[PDB]
């Protein structure tokens, strides 16, 4: 029962896109079929729209505890 919001904050979007773009730039496997793209940023955005990025967000609650979220679990807006 994750009490936090099911939405992706803009900061989470920024960090996950940047990190996955850097991963793709480091010759990582791409969990979506590209369509002739070369920029890691566009490929990361395509994966985000596909909801196919393997990152797990860990939101630290202020009481020291935390919640864990799959990117596909959150609502991408």
């Amino acid at each position: 029962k994750r009490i936090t919001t099911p939405y992706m904050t803009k900061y989470e979007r920024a960090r996950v896109l940047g990190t996955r773009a850097l991963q793709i730039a480091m010759c990582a496997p791409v969990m979506v079929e590209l369509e002739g793209e070369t920029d890691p940023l566009l490929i990361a955005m395509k994966e985000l729209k596909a909801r196919k990025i393997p990152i797990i967000i860990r939101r630290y609650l202020p009481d020291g505890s935390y919640e864990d979220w799959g990117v596909d679990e959150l609502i991408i807006s």
Binding site: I24, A25, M26, C27, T38, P40
Partner: protein, 48 residues
């Protein structure tokens, strides 16, 4: 021409970045440095 950005070599941009390295600092667009994984900095205005 002076200010620069660091692009990581990948199998997609290897051709484009190779051509940029070939051009060097003289022409625009070009490049200044190759940073291999060892950390050695090959400056692209003195080593043809």
């Amino acid at each position: 021409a002076n200010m620069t950005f660091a692009e990581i070599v990948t199998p997609f941009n290897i051709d484009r970045l190779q051509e940029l390295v070939r051009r060097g600092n003289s022409q625009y667009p070009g490049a200044k440095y190759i940073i291999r994984d060892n950390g050695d900095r090959i400056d692209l205005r003195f080593h043809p």
